[PDB]
Write a protein that binds this ligand. Structure first.
Ligand SMILES: Cc1cc2nc3c(=O)[nH]c(=O)nc-3n(C[C@H](O)[C@H](O)[C@H](O)COP(=O)(O)OP(=O)(O)OC[C@H]3O[C@@H](n4cnc5c(N)ncnc54)[C@H](O)[C@@H]3O)c2cc1C
Ligand SMILES: Cc1cc2nc3c(=O)[nH]c(=O)nc-3n(C[C@H](O)[C@H](O)[C@H](O)COP(=O)(O)OP(=O)(O)OC[C@H]3O[C@@H](n4cnc5c(N)ncnc54)[C@H](O)[C@@H]3O)c2cc1C
Ligand SMILES: Cc1cc2nc3c(=O)[nH]c(=O)nc-3n(C[C@H](O)[C@H](O)[C@H](O)COP(=O)(O)OP(=O)(O)OC[C@H]3O[C@@H](n4cnc5c(N)ncnc54)[C@H](O)[C@@H]3O)c2cc1C
Ligand SMILES: Cc1ncc(C[n+]2csc(CCOP(=O)(O)OP(=O)(O)O)c2C)c(N)n1
Ligand SMILES: Cc1ncc(C[n+]2csc(CCOP(=O)(O)OP(=O)(O)O)c2C)c(N)n1
Ligand SMILES: Cc1ncc(C[n+]2csc(CCOP(=O)(O)OP(=O)(O)O)c2C)c(N)n1
Ligand SMILES: [Cl-]
Ligand SMILES: [Cl-]
Ligand SMILES: [Cl-]
Ligand SMILES: [Mg+2]
Ligand SMILES: [Mg+2]
Ligand SMILES: [Mg+2]
Ligand SMILES: [Mg+2]
Lengths: 586, 587, 586
């Protein structure tokens, strides 16, 4: 059948499992938008305030789905706004396909052309960058983008299509590849690696299992609970792994790292052996700026590139996390030294429970005060009174990230959302909208700084139009508080940190959202209940300190080193001059 | 003397003429911010709501100054938001230096590193992209950045500095290059070319001078006025040249192009000869999608790369526009055929004045009407009543661009501001703020669509804190109106075009800005007076139709061709298969 | 200890298993060459005639080793000659680390600098491109290069080091990473994939096992012989898999593809099911220009990116080849329908043996003629009379490639060498020298065209100095014979194809190599024996036809389509003009 390129693009996106489009109109996306209007997927299009806001919504949707279920589709020059969000998808292992419609290919390469988008600016960012030259390659390119996006590692794929190809027509026989099959990701380890790992776990005096985001992608929660109880081993997570192990269990230490739980950092400092499952041991994760001292460890991952890149394991294993744990459960009864004892009667139990109790007491101290400015831990304690086990906690980047991580106590995977890998400010609100779109049975609570909310609160248009009842707490300190704090630690003086806020309640009201300020009432619990009862997206303005959280609160961190001290650098004495130095020798 | 890298960056920036810093804090920019607080640049730093809004401020400031007087200074990952504004600077010839402070160079190349910014993403965009490896190269790199940014062509330069270098210390002797004097840009044409141009000008029956943005950069307004009156030749501009020739003058046809003045398009369709000065004859400018048919022309530019790239001139000349005009004024009295008479007495005068009068009549007609929605031409007629020669008009991108260009009548250079080269939606508000910062005692009027204002109205934080009294008209139609209109033509139905607006008056009030709606009153005139009296940034809501402007209004355009008709493309029958086609051959 | 950067580079290369250096002097490599002179590896440095010749020697050495045992080390501007060889390492999955010493970092970025090498020219080619900015990163960068080079997929890694860092000195504590461990590559499939594959193999009427170069990298020869005999299934290979199955066995069909064995192409056209082990199903391999019609197939690979990129399998499996075959052997006795029958009594045996016999008869016809010009199959039959099972057959690219592939009958893996993935002319001689260096118990026979030998016969300097007794047959036709042939098929006329040859015997004698021409004697067997007895590198000049081989001989190929027919292309009628068209409208 003769088909337009725009209709072939839509067909391909449906074939590969696209649920949700985030698209922006312009003459280069006109044919694609027309084609979407005639398709099932046309019913699910978000038109965001900006393309960067929309790209963040793709990230939040796909982070919780672990596939490229949301897809961006962008008129030419709007693609120039994608880079920040695309970079987070790359290091954060978020599958994300983006289709950029460039200007007419007839006008490419002309020096005085308008809106000829430099697609090679994505080459250092996307896991796959393709410029499509020919209509008969449009299906093939989209198939490749999905294959790359949803691989191991997951990430972003960008497809640049000059829009004349979307108007042009071709007979469609076999053009969109169909019948594609994926290999299973249930990679099994060899027996001798399993037996080694089991022997180490049993022999250790103070073992720990470290579960990262790969345990969530693997689906390994059940196996992890069984394995931890069978061996009697405390569980530490990364921030993307939090919730794969129920955080109210006796063995749950929470997340390690610099915005994590001190019980987890205590346990990592005490441990003599770690089994690492589905973690990349990253800079702002377990590595803490490449300062953390890892105990002897076994490292299990589906991506060999993460294994031994920086931390050298006792043993590196290419295997699926759930599968490896199931293999361990099978081998453990025939492992020398193994005895079936209830985890509460193991010799290591009391130490772990003491670390957790100390942390819980510290959290109770942070949360229990009343009045203004509010503690962000109090705010989170109020959220946990109204929180369901499928609900999603979202945060932005700043001082506030620490209380959001520390006050989230989670029972399910992929419930904690932010720009985890890159720490890009402003992510929180639009990522929360994308997560809400993906998870309509989840209540979504966002704790955002004021500096952060400034970036993409324009997306209240989307929240209101699409009836997305995200509950946003804006923590107001009229500051980039992390930076106020750190600059005063570093220099004794802040600069570039302070700003005004609008009347946020007035902003919410102007968009037809629910708005309330607790500046005078302190009534966080009441405001949460009113916001939930509204059925609308909500904005609760909560005054906070400039200093509480990431840049101040002691959670057992060692890094990262970002207040670095300068070194004195030898000049070059080889004889060559600086530019303009010739004038000094006259 | 031992200096930190941060201090050396500030010293270099000062040496090369920086007046205004737009900066964003984060740990990688901490040392730089601390160093700026010790400088006379520290006082005035703008900390924008987002880095892309700030980069648009840099572009508005520098577009009106014609030098990189504003600089950006950005914490690592905030650099990832620069690319759209940087691309406008590249094709739009805006000088702009951006200093990106990357994460620690010790951590670079590690696969699981955080915030290691891919500076090579700028390589296809900036005129110059540099990654600094060594502290002793920090001065040198910044010197090079200004050299490129302020050359011919002007454009953006990006410098990536791992921030450990900003903390490190070194002895400063000769490290910051000082004391350069740049080459003059008053490039003179060969006398033979000047003579040839004068001979064509005099011989033509219906000549036109086409003056682009290079006449503004050249400072050629006085020479152009003398030349045009001496020969008695109508003046057409580009959108970046508008205002180089006073648009109240009887010879002024306005700007040619598809959002231009029909008088200018009529003139260019009538002309038998054009002298093109300081124009790149661009796609969304004079070329209108490479459809415009140029008469025989002489082309004068400082950048050889624009001369003969697409339109082949009769004669191409590498020269400065003001200089070339001065040369031609000197030779004209000795040119065979030249007659010294008042321009009003020339045979070609009446036709030009007729084009202008017809256009002015049409504009008057668009200003008329008595209710709601309002005409955007009416809105511009009201702005003209309160507009001085030094005042700046800013637009965003959409249907509203055509009435803003058609209602702006300018008499000085560099008074009309937008994302000219790239058409990037959202530019208007933050570029207006940057123009206001560059010219604190000029009044700045912005006409913006509602889809446009959505992008960077967060920068009301900057406008209110810095008391930048931009007067913004937001034209409300609850739509991407250009697209609503074009898609209804193309397909019979719009899609992806309609959206909710907030209460814009309420948004302004929540920031402490002046706000008013004319929806019930029609009182644009009073709203402009109240907005001006407020001394605050102001927002005037004006409801408009979905259709008025770029997608509907006839201005004599021929292009561009964006409502494409597709072609039917043949399938490859050479034998090779599609992916997956193997399954279709199984029996 | 305080150490120079040059000494740290040497230390790192030794730590990661480097055996052989190929290096080129210049002031930027002076410190590195001095450092090598003080080390164990210093004893194994080849200084090639050119850097491209040397890069090809790295490729040949590492192709047969399946690790980056050879390493290039190059003065600045000589790195500009590496790209061709580097591209073959990338698509050909050859591990190869190259260390480029750039000019002084103090002079980088200056517009009028000399010898500042654009290392970003490698970014689209190498699997890893790194520019080292800091002395304390030199060890770390080399460790990363090896990790990437020796991964799955294998490939080239380029490290650019400004040479001032190689003169500079630093305390060495922990700078060169030591104690690195690799994960095993014995990835196991899940049982249900094993059982599926076994059920298909047993149920098929006319199965085939297709073994590619991954069976060689895996070490799977023993398991493949067992599995093929147990199930009674003919074996087809790719050109990089040839020799993993003994090519004299009754079940051996040889290599499929356009320069392969017709028995293999016949068997692929007859088969109802294929088990593909360690093949990427590539363009100039099994795909034959994306024309080959694959039967229903199971696809087993360690690199998920190859699985389902173009040919969509019944089932895709991420697993090691040897391991998967061992899993199949274990499952087969409990697979429904399986009976233990001698392979000679299976119903499919006679068909396979008939295909092989037809091919063998055709080869005997090609080889059996005497006189001049010689048949290249006769030449290969003479080599097989003097060939040991560890000996290596090398070819260049041209008409001659077909008789070299067709006359090679191999018993061991990694014995057939050329620029397999990219077909880059001139590879053969320097790749043969690298293979000889790696495999000193192998006699190396190169069959090269004349056009090919022209590129790197300057490397006779290396062959003679290092006493590398490669036996080179130069097939002389005074032509780019493939192109003479194909152009006459395509157009009825050749152009740019014909050239003179030097007196090749005189060239060999001038270098102190053994030289002989059979132009008048026909005495190929005698010349081989004299060349072997010399103990020297040898050059035997053998006149051949312009047309025999790749461009003419029918081996059951279907592709690739490189004599493509042009299509008539619609002009653009949108209204926009061409450059300069304005003058036509005046
Ligand atoms: C301000 C800020 C503070 C932060 N504080 C912390 C903190 O305190 N603690 C913390 O942990 N992080 C923190 N982060 C997040 C951190 O930067 C990283 O994003 C995070 O630690 C990475 O988690 P991960 O190692 O589990 O790997 P992910 O990025 O989640 O990657 C998943 C890993 O699992 C592997 N994998 C995927 N599927 C499978 C499978 N089926 N089987 C096996 N392996 C699989 C992948 O190959 C990869 O190695 C912070 C971020 C910011 C911005
Ligand atoms: C929606 C929309 C509508 C638009 N409609 C129009 C329209 O109707 N008409 C229009 O003109 N544009 C229009 N534009 C703008 C258009 O895209 C271009 O930005 C503009 O036309 C370019 O102007 P220019 O040719 O003068 O060159 P500029 O981009 O201003 O560049 C300056 C030129 O002068 C040269 N130069 C610089 N200094 C000197 C010197 N000293 N001497 C000599 N030469 C010098 C430079 O090398 C260059 O060639 C529109 C843009 C948009 C987004
Ligand atoms: C002139 C010319 C003619 C040619 N003619 C032919 C021809 O007739 N026939 C032919 O086959 N080729 C031919 N080639 C070569 C062809 O271009 C390819 O180089 C070759 O076919 C690729 O072989 P392969 O598919 O086995 O993959 P390779 O390139 O050998 O790659 C190895 C594959 O095995 C996988 N792998 C690696 N280790 C393992 C493991 N442990 N377990 C499982 N999988 C593993 C890899 O991921 C990869 O997919 C020709 C080349 C030229 C230049
Ligand atoms: C795009 C971008 N710009 C700047 C930063 C640097 N940064 C990291 S945290 C932070 C403070 C954010 O302020 P806010 O949201 O108010 O949170 P608070 O620290 O006050 O809790 C900043 C500016 C960044 N990570 N990303
Ligand atoms: C970043 C970006 N996204 C999309 C476009 C496409 N576009 C061009 S004009 C326009 C309409 C803008 O709407 P608005 O500001 O309301 O103006 P109106 O057409 O209603 O006057 C759009 C979406 C663009 N140029 N840039
Ligand atoms: C570097 C490079 N240049 C050109 C070619 C194109 N090419 C492929 S085969 C061939 C013929 C080689 O001639 P020769 O070595 O004499 O072999 P013959 O065809 O005569 O057997 C040529 C030129 C190539 N593959 N690589
Ligand atoms: Cl547009
Ligand atoms: Cl940050
Ligand atoms: Cl040299
Ligand atoms: Mg804050
Ligand atoms: Mg100069
Ligand atoms: Mg609008
Ligand atoms: Mg030849």
């Amino acid at each position: 059948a003769i088909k337009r390129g725009a209709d072939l693009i839509v067909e391909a996106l449906e074939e590969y499992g696209t649920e949700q489009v985030v698209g922006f109109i312009g003459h280069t996306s006109h044919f694609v938008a027309d084609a979407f209007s005639k398709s099932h997927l046309g019913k699910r299009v978000i038109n965001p305030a900006t393309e960067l806001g929309g790209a963040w919504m793709v990230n939040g949707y796909n982070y919780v789905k672990d596939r490229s279920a949301a897809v961006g589709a962008w008129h030419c020059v709007g693609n120039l706004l994608l880079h920040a969000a695309m970079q987070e998808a790359r290091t954060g292992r978020i599958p994300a396909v983006h289709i950029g419609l460039n200007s007419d290919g007839r006008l490419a390469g002309r020096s005085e052309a308008a809106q000829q988008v430099p697609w090679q600016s994505f080459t250092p960012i996307a896991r796959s960058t393709q410029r499509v030259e020919r209509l008969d390659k449009v299906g093939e390119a989209i198939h490749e983008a999905f294959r790359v996006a949803e691989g191991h590692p997951a990430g972003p794929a960008y497809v640049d299509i000059p829009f004349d190809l979307t108007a042009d027509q071709i007979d469609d026989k076999a053009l969109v590849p169909r019948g594609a099959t994926r290999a299973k990701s249930v990679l099994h380890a060899p027996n001798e690696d399993v037996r080694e790992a089991a022997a180490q776990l049993v022999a250790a005096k103070n073992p720990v299992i470290l579960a990262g985001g790969g345990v969530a992608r693997s689906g390994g929660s059940e196996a992890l609970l069984k394995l931890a109880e069978m061996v009697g081993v405390p569980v530490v997570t990364t921030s993307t792994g939090a919730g794969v192990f129920p955080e109210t269990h006796a063995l749950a230490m929470g997340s390690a790292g610099f915005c994590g739980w001190k019980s987890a950092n205590d346990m990592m400092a005490a441990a003599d052996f770690v089994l690492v499952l589905g973690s990349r041991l990253s800079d702002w994760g377990i590595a803490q700026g490449y300062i953390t001292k890892m105990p002897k460890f076994v490292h299990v991952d589906t991506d060999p590139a993460v294994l031994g890149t920086f931390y050298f394991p006792l043993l590196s294993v290419v295997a699926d996390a759930k599968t490896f744990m199931e293999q361990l459960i099978e081998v453990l009864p025939g492992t020398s030294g193994f005895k079936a004892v209830r985890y509460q009667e193991r010799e290591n139990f009391r130490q772990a429970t003491e670390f957790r109790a100390a942390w819980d007491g510290w959290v109770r101290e942070q949360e229990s005060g009343d009045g203004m400015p509010a503690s962000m831990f109090r705010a989170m304690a109020e959220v946990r009174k109204v929180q369901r086990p499928e609900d999603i906690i979202v945060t932005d980047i700043g001082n506030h990230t620490l209380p959001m991580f520390g006050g989230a106590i989670l029972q399910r995977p992929r419930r904690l959302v932010t720009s985890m890998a890159e720490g890009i400010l402003g992510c929180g609100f639009p990522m929360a909208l994308g997560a809400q779109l993906a998870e309509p049975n989840s209540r979504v609570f966002l704790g955002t700084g004021d500096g952060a909310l400034y970036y993409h609160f324009n997306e209240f248009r989307v929240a209101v139009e699409h009836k997305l009842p995200v509950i946003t707490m804006v923590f107001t300190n009229e500051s980039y508080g992390a930076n106020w704090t750190l600059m005063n630690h570093q220099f004794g003086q802040n600069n570039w940190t302070e700003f005004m806020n609008p009347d946020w309640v007035g902003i919410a009201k102007a968009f037809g959202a629910y708005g309330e300020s607790v500046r005078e009432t302190g009534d966080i619990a009441g405001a949460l209940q009113r916001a939930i009862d509204s059925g609308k997206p909500a904005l609760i303005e909560i005054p906070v300190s400039k200093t509480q959280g990431l840049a101040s609160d002691p959670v057992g961190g060692v890094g990262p080193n970002l207040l670095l001290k300068g070194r004195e650098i030898p000049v070059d004495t080889g004889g060559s001059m600086y530019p303009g130095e010739n004038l000094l020798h006259l």
